[PDB]
Design a protein around this ligand. Sequence first.
Ligand SMILES: CC(C)CCC[C@@H](C)[C@H]1CC[C@H]2[C@@H]3CC=C4C[C@@H](OC(=O)CCC(=O)O)CC[C@]4(C)[C@H]3CC[C@]12C
Ligand SMILES: CC(C)CCC[C@@H](C)[C@H]1CC[C@H]2[C@@H]3CC=C4C[C@@H](OC(=O)CCC(=O)O)CC[C@]4(C)[C@H]3CC[C@]12C
Ligand SMILES: CCCCCCCCCCCCO[C@@H]1O[C@H](CO)[C@@H](O[C@H]2O[C@H](CO)[C@@H](O)[C@H](O)[C@H]2O)[C@H](O)[C@H]1O
Ligand SMILES: CCCCCCCCCCCCO[C@@H]1O[C@H](CO)[C@@H](O[C@H]2O[C@H](CO)[C@@H](O)[C@H](O)[C@H]2O)[C@H](O)[C@H]1O
Lengths: 54, 54
Amino acid sequence: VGQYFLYGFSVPGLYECNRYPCIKEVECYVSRPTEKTVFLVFMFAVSGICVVLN
Amino acid sequence: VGQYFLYGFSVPGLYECNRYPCIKEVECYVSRPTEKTVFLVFMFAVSGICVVLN
Ligand SMILES: CC(C)CCC[C@@H](C)[C@H]1CC[C@H]2[C@@H]3CC=C4C[C@@H](OC(=O)CCC(=O)O)CC[C@]4(C)[C@H]3CC[C@]12C
Ligand SMILES: CC(C)CCC[C@@H](C)[C@H]1CC[C@H]2[C@@H]3CC=C4C[C@@H](OC(=O)CCC(=O)O)CC[C@]4(C)[C@H]3CC[C@]12C
Ligand SMILES: CCCCCCCCCCCCO[C@@H]1O[C@H](CO)[C@@H](O[C@H]2O[C@H](CO)[C@@H](O)[C@H](O)[C@H]2O)[C@H](O)[C@H]1O
Ligand SMILES: CCCCCCCCCCCCO[C@@H]1O[C@H](CO)[C@@H](O[C@H]2O[C@H](CO)[C@@H](O)[C@H](O)[C@H]2O)[C@H](O)[C@H]1O
């Protein structure tokens, strides 16, 4: 449940952030999103299989 | 009238712009605003004196 609520399914390649150091909203880029989301989906499937067995 | 409507009185030292090349709104800085606005005010005063004489 925590993994589902925290990370989700897909990893956004493009992010928009606006904190104190940055004067206005800025656009940052993430590296290798596809591999991260694929492996996250695989981990979620493995956890679901383990839950079903339990 | 054209000078009053176009430029105004004060020259903003800080500008906020958002055009097609710039993804989001960005903050640009102007150099020597005080001298520009002072000389513009002097030119406006000279034009007003000339208008009064005319
Ligand atoms: C032992 C058995 C029951 C395991 C079954 C595994 C499922 C819990 C997993 C396997 C594949 C997963 C799917 C793979 C791909 C996607 C697309 C994905 O779409 C997006 O990321 C874009 C849309 C959105 O933001 O939801 C939404 C989740 C979903 C349906 C996943 C939902 C969860 C699924 C069905
Ligand atoms: C022959 C005689 C009638 C000439 C008179 C000259 C005036 C037309 C000029 C001289 C000084 C000028 C002033 C000098 C400084 C300012 C402050 C200036 O304030 C700002 O820039 C911030 C506020 C705003 O945005 O209006 C507004 C215009 C004003 C009153 C100017 C209005 C026009 C004035 C009165
Ligand atoms: C052992 C048990 C552990 C229990 C753990 C419970 C953790 C709870 C975390 C609460 C977090 C609240 O803040 C939560 O942040 C996440 C991610 O940061 C946001 O999540 C959002 O962005 C992430 C990526 O950043 C996307 O993958 C997701 O789909 C989207 O919803 C949630 O919208 C927000 O609700
Ligand atoms: C010989 C006669 C010539 C007649 C000339 C008539 C020119 C008319 C120009 C119309 C322009 C309309 O666009 C006009 O742009 C100016 C400046 O770009 C804006 O002006 C705004 O920004 C400028 C600085 O950039 C400030 O100094 C000004 O106080 C503020 O109002 C006006 O808010 C907008 O109305």
